[PDB]
Design an enzyme around this catalytic site. Sequence first.
Site, mmCIF file in Angstrom:
data_model
loop_
_atom_site.group_PDB
_atom_site.id
_atom_site.type_symbol
_atom_site.label_atom_id
_atom_site.label_comp_id
_atom_site.label_asym_id
_atom_site.label_seq_id
_atom_site.Cartn_x
_atom_site.Cartn_y
_atom_site.Cartn_z
ATOM 1 N N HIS A 12 0.768 -1.241 0.000
ATOM 2 C CA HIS A 12 0.000 0.000 0.000
ATOM 3 C C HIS A 12 0.800 1.293 0.000
ATOM 4 O O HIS A 12 0.182 2.342 -0.151
ATOM 5 C CB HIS A 12 -0.949 0.031 1.211
ATOM 6 C CG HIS A 12 -1.964 -1.059 1.192
ATOM 7 N ND1 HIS A 12 -2.910 -1.167 0.197
ATOM 8 C CD2 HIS A 12 -2.172 -2.108 2.026
ATOM 9 C CE1 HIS A 12 -3.664 -2.230 0.423
ATOM 10 N NE2 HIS A 12 -3.232 -2.820 1.523
ATOM 11 N N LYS A 41 -5.018 -9.907 -7.383
ATOM 12 C CA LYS A 41 -5.694 -9.235 -6.288
ATOM 13 C C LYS A 41 -6.765 -8.345 -6.903
ATOM 14 O O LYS A 41 -6.446 -7.519 -7.772
ATOM 15 C CB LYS A 41 -4.733 -8.408 -5.438
ATOM 16 C CG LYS A 41 -5.425 -7.710 -4.287
ATOM 17 C CD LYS A 41 -4.472 -7.304 -3.174
ATOM 18 C CE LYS A 41 -5.258 -6.713 -2.004
ATOM 19 N NZ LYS A 41 -4.379 -6.140 -0.954
ATOM 20 N N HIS A 119 -3.487 -3.128 7.769
ATOM 21 C CA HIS A 119 -4.507 -3.445 6.768
ATOM 22 C C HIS A 119 -5.061 -2.129 6.236
ATOM 23 O O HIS A 119 -5.219 -1.176 6.997
ATOM 24 C CB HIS A 119 -5.593 -4.335 7.395
ATOM 25 C CG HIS A 119 -6.879 -4.404 6.623
ATOM 26 N ND1 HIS A 119 -7.047 -5.189 5.499
ATOM 27 C CD2 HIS A 119 -8.085 -3.827 6.860
ATOM 28 C CE1 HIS A 119 -8.286 -5.063 5.053
ATOM 29 N NE2 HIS A 119 -8.938 -4.245 5.865
ATOM 30 N N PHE A 120 -5.316 -2.057 4.929
ATOM 31 C CA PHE A 120 -5.956 -0.879 4.354
ATOM 32 C C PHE A 120 -7.445 -1.163 4.257
ATOM 33 O O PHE A 120 -7.848 -2.079 3.546
ATOM 34 C CB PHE A 120 -5.398 -0.555 2.967
ATOM 35 C CG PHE A 120 -5.867 0.762 2.449
ATOM 36 C CD1 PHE A 120 -7.138 0.890 1.896
ATOM 37 C CD2 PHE A 120 -5.062 1.873 2.572
ATOM 38 C CE1 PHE A 120 -7.589 2.134 1.451
ATOM 39 C CE2 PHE A 120 -5.513 3.126 2.132
ATOM 40 C CZ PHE A 120 -6.764 3.234 1.558
ATOM 41 N N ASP A 121 -8.266 -0.398 4.976
ATOM 42 C CA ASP A 121 -9.669 -0.777 5.099
ATOM 43 C C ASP A 121 -10.570 -0.070 4.109
ATOM 44 O O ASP A 121 -11.506 -0.689 3.589
ATOM 45 C CB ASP A 121 -10.181 -0.508 6.517
ATOM 46 C CG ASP A 121 -11.280 -1.493 6.948
ATOM 47 O OD1 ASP A 121 -11.095 -2.724 6.772
ATOM 48 O OD2 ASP A 121 -12.312 -1.035 7.497
HETATM 49 N N1 LIG Z 1 -9.487 -4.753 11.561
HETATM 50 C C1 LIG Z 1 -8.462 -5.463 11.102
HETATM 51 N N2 LIG Z 1 -7.283 -5.570 11.728
HETATM 52 C C2 LIG Z 1 -6.310 -6.284 11.223
HETATM 53 N N3 LIG Z 1 -6.449 -6.947 10.112
HETATM 54 C C3 LIG Z 1 -7.560 -6.922 9.442
HETATM 55 C C4 LIG Z 1 -8.642 -6.143 9.902
HETATM 56 N N4 LIG Z 1 -9.631 -6.281 9.020
HETATM 57 C C5 LIG Z 1 -9.250 -7.070 8.121
HETATM 58 N N5 LIG Z 1 -7.989 -7.473 8.315
HETATM 59 C C6 LIG Z 1 -7.219 -8.351 7.470
HETATM 60 O O1 LIG Z 1 -7.435 -7.986 6.111
HETATM 61 C C7 LIG Z 1 -7.468 -9.133 5.275
HETATM 62 C C8 LIG Z 1 -8.928 -9.058 4.819
HETATM 63 O O2 LIG Z 1 -9.207 -9.440 3.489
HETATM 64 P P1 LIG Z 1 -9.761 -8.328 2.429
HETATM 65 O O3 LIG Z 1 -9.527 -6.796 2.682
HETATM 66 O O4 LIG Z 1 -11.170 -8.437 2.259
HETATM 67 O O5 LIG Z 1 -8.755 -8.489 1.173
HETATM 68 P P2 LIG Z 1 -8.107 -9.879 0.673
HETATM 69 O O6 LIG Z 1 -9.283 -10.657 0.036
HETATM 70 O O7 LIG Z 1 -7.283 -9.416 -0.411
HETATM 71 O O8 LIG Z 1 -7.278 -10.859 1.608
HETATM 72 P P3 LIG Z 1 -5.747 -10.365 1.565
HETATM 73 O O9 LIG Z 1 -5.094 -10.659 0.312
HETATM 74 O O10 LIG Z 1 -5.034 -11.050 2.808
HETATM 75 O O11 LIG Z 1 -5.849 -8.809 1.623
HETATM 76 P P4 LIG Z 1 -4.713 -8.397 2.601
HETATM 77 O O12 LIG Z 1 -5.035 -8.766 3.970
HETATM 78 O O13 LIG Z 1 -3.374 -9.226 2.280
HETATM 79 O O14 LIG Z 1 -4.302 -6.875 2.306
HETATM 80 P P5 LIG Z 1 -5.033 -5.826 3.134
HETATM 81 O O15 LIG Z 1 -5.152 -6.282 4.532
HETATM 82 O O16 LIG Z 1 -4.487 -4.319 3.144
HETATM 83 O O17 LIG Z 1 -6.444 -5.843 2.376
HETATM 84 C C9 LIG Z 1 -7.204 -10.341 6.231
HETATM 85 O O18 LIG Z 1 -5.849 -10.651 6.452
HETATM 86 C C10 LIG Z 1 -7.748 -9.786 7.561
HETATM 87 O O19 LIG Z 1 -7.302 -10.425 8.748
#
Ligand SMILES: Nc1ncnc2c1ncn2[C@@H]1O[C@H](COP(=O)(O)OP(=O)(O)OP(=O)(O)OP(=O)(O)OP(=O)(O)O)[C@@H](O)[C@H]1O
Length: 124
Positions: A12, A41, A119-121
């Site tokens: 990010h 992704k 995490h980017f929410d």
């Molecule tokens: N409040 C929070 N605190 C810490 N972590 C949090 C969180 N909410 C979600 N995650 C963490 O974000 C991912 C969610 O999948 P998503 O945003 O719906 O995207 P994704 O389908 O792409 O799954 P990932 O590839 O793991 O996306 P990423 O986690 O790697 O990248 P990101 O977290 O910035 O979206 C999981 O690892 C979850 O524990």
Amino acid sequence: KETAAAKFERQHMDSSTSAASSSNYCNQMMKSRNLTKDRCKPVNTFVHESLADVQAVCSQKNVACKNGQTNCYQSYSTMSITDCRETGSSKYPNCAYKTTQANKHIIVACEGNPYVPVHFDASV
Ligand SMILES: Nc1ncnc2c1ncn2[C@@H]1O[C@H](COP(=O)(O)OP(=O)(O)OP(=O)(O)OP(=O)(O)OP(=O)(O)O)[C@@H](O)[C@H]1O
């Protein structure tokens, strides 16, 4: 062992430019940051601010996370970001993306000691 904070930076952070370069930005950036390597992704955001400015969001406006946790934080200032969204003609391993530049408040989830973005929410 990539830390969650390091993964956040790889997924990010892009402090080098002020805004999305070309229409080509996401195609190249999603590739080089290893976001297309097991699959495409579907959506991803890059933040064009200093690491210190993004880290500081962990002490800014506390807001509910999309998953219901309470550890999300919204930036008080707008930030330069780029949204990457997979196209319909995109088929792995030829991930192709639409590149949208914007200035928006970012919402990140933070964890750890030190308390840092993991995490980017959302952006709003
Ligand atoms: N409040 C929070 N605190 C810490 N972590 C949090 C969180 N909410 C979600 N995650 C963490 O974000 C991912 C969610 O999948 P998503 O945003 O719906 O995207 P994704 O389908 O792409 O799954 P990932 O590839 O793991 O996306 P990423 O986690 O790697 O990248 P990101 O977290 O910035 O979206 C999981 O690892 C979850 O524990």
